[PDB]
């Protein structure tokens, strides 16, 4: 119920299902964005995953244990968004990040646009390590989107 | 509300992939609620 991989986060009511986001299972911990689940418990097969840590300002939450993803963008190399859009198979999109320049340092940022339920899709370095999650960002003047590469602290 | 997860794939880098998108350099601020905004 916690095998490594990328997962869709779904909700179902009486009718069908809706994909509200995506997350990463690594080292027995599920990692996603706070705005996807709001820390609600997650069903995985017959099991239940409970929130362990989170931070609304970082827009991150982990389940079952502390945040495990610690790879960092090197500030130089191209990366891949492993986008998992609703209703579409996972696909890798290679890009050279831009930068969010903030008063508290710079953050890599990817100019790729996907539906809201793609939130939490992992961004990867060339070694396949998860350098952050996609889906907390800004809209620029032409209407397109730029997502921070949001990484937690391990 | 039943919130659940389902596997979608293995986390792997794709060799010879589509390189797309630009690399914007933006001045942004982050509020305590986790919202980024452009500095004007």
């Amino acid at each position: 119920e916690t095998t490594d991989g990328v997962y869709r986060v779904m909700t179902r009511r009486l009718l069908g299902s809706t994909q509200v986001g995506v997350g990463v299972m690594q080292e027995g911990v599920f990692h996603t964005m706070w705005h996807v689940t709001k820390g609600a418990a997650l069903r995985s097969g017959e099991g239940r995953l409970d929130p362990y840590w989170g931070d609304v300002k970082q827009d991150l939450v982990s389940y079952c244990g502390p945040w495990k993803l610690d790879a960092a963008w090197d500030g130089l190399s191209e990366v891949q968004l492993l986008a998992v859009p609703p209703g579409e198979r996972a696909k890798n999109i290679q890009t050279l990040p831009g930068i969010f320049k903030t008063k508290d340092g710079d953050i890599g940022a990817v100019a790729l646009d996907y539906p809201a339920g793609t939130s939490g899709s992992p961004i990867l370095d060339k070694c396949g390590r998860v350098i952050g999650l996609y889906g907390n960002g800004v809209v620029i003047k032409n209407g397109s989107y730029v997502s921070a590469i949001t990484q937690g602290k391990r | 509300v039943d919130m659940y997860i389902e596997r979608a794939g293995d986390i792997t880098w794709e060799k010879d992939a589509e390189v797309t998108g630009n690399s914007p350099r933006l001045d942004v601020a982050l509020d305590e609620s986790g919202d980024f905004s452009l500095v004007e």
Partner: peptide, 4 residues
Amino acid sequence: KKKX
């Protein structure tokens, strides 16, 4: 776009 959370900012489709």
